[PDB]
């Protein structure tokens, strides 16, 4: 369909002739610099390749203000997503309208130039509740007070070049590109799958239905840009991706990276990405149960109503210019070989099997079977490799600030126990003295499947530095990892209830 | 037999009841202390335990001299390998005869009081000559003139107690707790096996052909102190035995770990190793070919000739008192599926198999199959884990002082391509800022496996701080593992380098 | 020994008549099945014959047959104590039992599904299988129904490129018969050696008689259509789509 707002706004192309000159401006020693953040990056990338049409910059107060209260541009265009360029007041104060400044990545590559239309402090509290639903634990929200700037800066972009991206250069297609792709294939029927998750049977499933029904060809369309923390990262996910869409018939399915950076903001999310995929050339687009949702609050409560999503779309059906696909998600029916969708089974009594996220992070942990009518084994290959199991994991032992026996001695004591037992496993015993950038690196070594001895604790305003994954305390503290006897438990004691700690949790097995 | 010279010298048995006294001496305020180096360590432990029986303390430089020149102390007792406390001038200036000094490890653990009987600076030149034969190469003359000090303390030794091991507490057996595993089973007649290396197929073999032989029962006595440079560590050495110690016939064979320093002397240490046995309790002793021999120098001339060994033993076998046998090595016969000595085949036209160290350890690199008539598969599955191959390797590239590209962009399209790639490697871009404690966990991570990505080079003086394994320069000058066609080669061109780089040597597998 | 009979499938008197057959070929006993020689249930569900009236019938004959009739004992597997047992004996005490039907068989059969040795002998499944292989190695026809007004001969030559992107070894065939009775008698031919027949026009009526009916599929937009159109003059690609995902959906093809 056509770009929301009828032109495809990629200023990439707009400004073609204009890139030499940009880009001289941006290094003048004169003019003011900005150097975006990660999110800003992933929202400058969409408006400079016409994702977000018919944005051609961040968000003055005018429409703004418009997109807060009435999910539209104050022109009434429908835009439910706030997208701004939030700076600090020591920035703020040296900005004006007019002002042109330069946008930069990594404090080194032009992106663009913004010319200022205002500068302003918005109410974080009212876009919080009116965009998000309020709840203090909202991703977005915990973004928007601790991460966020609090002045935006609304201005009109030029571009110079997209953010920078070394990996998949051939993946990360822009709406122009996109559409020409689709064209040559003389693709006229697509239907967009939106995902920040590895896929599964279901999904390859779900998403070939689509097509049939839709008479459409896929679109395979995951976000690898910020997604919900805690997601498993993006090139494990696009390893994942570029295993299944091998397992559609030929010439049914095609896989484009989309740089968007979620809100987890449900059903205004959910509307966004109808919008987007539009942009990118989709005719179609499938809208999930609890799209973009990020679950429950720690009260158990739902951010958003597992169908909230659909229901907002539907809407504004006759006005989003790209059908909806019902979502019909499916599930396995082992008497019959065979996957069928959920809303079609039970009540004949009919045996269905599934396997859930907190199972499945079970499985991959202890390095338990996981069946292919589930996953292809392909991709579970790919799942365990990028998280291994418990005996392949790393970690570190702190000797806590109680101990009184020798540190020296029962480090030593520690790593040439360790060094016994087989796997492969490499030990260190790692002294930080309290440095940044030796604690920064207790994470990388756990990561890399290491496991650490450390003779002392970190000062406490130092614990943001250090991860808290497979990070062990041993200490006579109630909140010991293991907890000890006594200050002065004799050495081999000391070790012996931390190797039986170790193989208790999985870290080795005999 | 009888221990040589008659009486075990067990000091810490003799020593028993005057431990509380000698601690607390030991501890005294007053009393100088000297901090045990790694290899006397390995040495006092022999001499405190009696397995240097006669010896009862380091040599003076009457002992000494009579060792150098005669291969016997003072007495006339045959001795081939000097034991001596080697220390510098600072604190041999504040030592004279009579003054008792206290000996710790790891400046926490008193291990025991020496009483000086002399002090004094022998001839490094005459050592190096006399006893390891002259070649500055040689692992002994080496050690004796970058590590040893430059003064000799002789004295006698009163026991506290023997140098603190916590790993493998079962194995590591005394002179005496050995005599007496070996009576509570009724052994008269045992062969003992010296080794610093993984047993194969062909050690399982010669041994208990060795056993037969002698009538004799089965000792294997690694060497877990201090080796040959380069060789496989002592854990990984260790998990080897105790896995084909239970290859044998039950009851035939008994492992024990020998916590000795080899000095690498050939001929020599073999009559000293022939020694050690003895007071250990072995009735035979199987000497090798170049046994204890560290091979060949850098101009490919032998620092022994192979057979020096079996002469020098067999010149003194009439004093020895514990029978030498004949070092008969075997060989698979794979059309009879069997093994036969080396000295019995061929000249009637007879196929056999070998894999060398350099194939074995080929195989290992490049993670090729290691047949079952040359190692159990138990043996090499240890072996593999220890020394994976180069898919599981770490690696490090470092960025060239030449490199006139920006080092942050280039480190980040390295670290995102490398991202792309499966496996399971951890990547880390790595800033040591020229510190040694950062510069000392470069090989920590390659070790873990990690690939890390070096902005920029160290200075020079820190060069020994770095291994040099797996570590590649990239750069223009010719020296470069990977070399630039120019300082300001494109970034992409360079990456593309570096991955077919490493692809090339075998780090990813596509 | 094999048996050049023609059964009638008359149950109980075919049953009669099997004895007297087996004595004359040499047999001193027989055995008479639950429902043998049988052919089911009728269109309405009612059965032909009585589970035992094969059995009551030869009974009553017992005293002039001269051959003696052994009790059918119909066996059983019992998992947890790894056997069979007569089906007679078991239950009422709680015991766990398993069997396959033979509308399970065939579905196995049909999908490549695995078949258990307390169920059958592998060597024996092994044929079944070969003689009956799974849909991946079926084949199959695709006939352009009469509604059609697009071109026939460029869908057929689009399905033809298509299906052999596919791996999997099927041959693949555009088969026109021209209506003649000796083309459209080798249709279950080809559809039996495995091959992907694309046969651009439907047969008259009168000839519906000589294709088999089994793996030949209607692409029209009637709704008797196996693949229905969604009009007749739906574009080319489109349908290409609609008739891969139905093949794929029936199990001839597997990505
Ligand atoms: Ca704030
Ligand atoms: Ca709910
Ligand atoms: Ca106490
Ligand atoms: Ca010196
Ligand atoms: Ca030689
Ligand atoms: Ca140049
Ligand atoms: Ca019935
Ligand atoms: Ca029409
Ligand atoms: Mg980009
Ligand atoms: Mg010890
Ligand atoms: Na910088
Ligand atoms: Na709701
Ligand atoms: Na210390
Ligand atoms: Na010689
Ligand atoms: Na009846």
């Not at 992070?361 to 990028?386: A, D, N």
Request: proline share 6%; with cysteine; aromatic share 10%.
């Amino acid at each position: 369909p056509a770009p929301h707002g009828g032109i495809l706004q990629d200023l990439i192309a707009r400004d073609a002739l204009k890139k030499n000159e940009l880009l001289s401006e941006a290094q003048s020693s004169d003019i003011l610099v900005w150097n975006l953040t990660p999110r800003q990056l992933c929202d400058i990338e969409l408006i400079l390749n016409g994702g977000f049409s018919p944005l051609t910059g961040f968000l003055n107060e005018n429409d703004y203000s418009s997109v807060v209260t009435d999910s539209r541009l104050a022109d009434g265009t429908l835009w439910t997503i706030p997208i701004t360029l939030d700076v600090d007041e020591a920035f703020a104060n040296q900005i004006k309208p007019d002002t042109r400044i330069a946008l930069f990545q990594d404090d080194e590559i032009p992106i663009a130039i913004l010319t200022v239309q205002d500068v302003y402090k918005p109410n974080k509290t009212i876009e919080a509740e009116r965009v998000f639903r309020g709840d203090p634990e909202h991703p977005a929200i915990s973004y928007l007070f601790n991460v966020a700037g609090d002045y935006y800066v609304g201005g009109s972009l030029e571009a110079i070049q997209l953010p920078q991206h070394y990996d998949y250069p051939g993946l990360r297609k822009t709406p122009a590109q996109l559409r020409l792709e689709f064209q040559s294939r003389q693709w006229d029927r697509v239907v967009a799958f939106q995902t920040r998750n590895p896929m599964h049977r279901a999904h390859r499933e779900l998403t070939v239905r689509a097509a049939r029904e839709a008479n459409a060809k896929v679109l395979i369309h995951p976000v690898v840009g910020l997604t919900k923390p805690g997601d498993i990262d993006h090139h494990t996910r696009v390893r994942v991706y570029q295993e299944i869409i091998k397992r559609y018939p030929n010439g049914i399915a095609f896989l484009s990276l989309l740089p968007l950076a979620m809100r987890m903001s449900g059903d205004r999310e959910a509307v966004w990405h109808a919008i987007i995929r539009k942009n990118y050339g989709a005719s179609h687009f499938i809208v999930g149960r609890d799209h973009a949702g990020p679950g429950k609050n720690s009260k158990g409560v739902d951010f958003y109503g597992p169908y909230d999503a659909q229901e907002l779309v539907e809407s504004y059906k006759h006005e989003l210019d790209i059908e909806v696909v019902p979502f019909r998600m499916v599930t396995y029916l082992p008497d019959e070989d065979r996957y069928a969708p959920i809303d079609q089974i039970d009540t004949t009594k009919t045996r269905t099997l599934n396997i859930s996220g907190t199972e499945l992070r079970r499985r991959l942990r202890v390095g338990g079977e996981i069946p292919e009518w589930f996953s292809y084994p392909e991709v579970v290959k790919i799942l365990r490799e990028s998280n291994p199991p418990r005996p392949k994991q790393g970690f570190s032992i702190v000797l806590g600030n109680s101990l009184t026996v020798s540190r020296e001695q029962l480090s030593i004591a520690l790593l040439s126990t360790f060094l016994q037992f087989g796997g492969g496993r490499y030990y260190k015993i790692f002294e930080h003295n309290n440095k940044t950038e030796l604690l920064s690196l207790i994470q990388d070594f756990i990561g890399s499947g290491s496991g650490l001895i450390i003779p002392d604790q970190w000062e406490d305003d130092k614990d943001s530095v250090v991860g808290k994954q497979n990070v062990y305390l041993l200490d006579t503290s109630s909140s010991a990892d293991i907890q000890l006897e006594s200050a002065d438990e004799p050495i081999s004691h000391i070790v012996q209830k931390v190797v039986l700690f170790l193989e208790d949790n999985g870290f080795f097995v005999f």
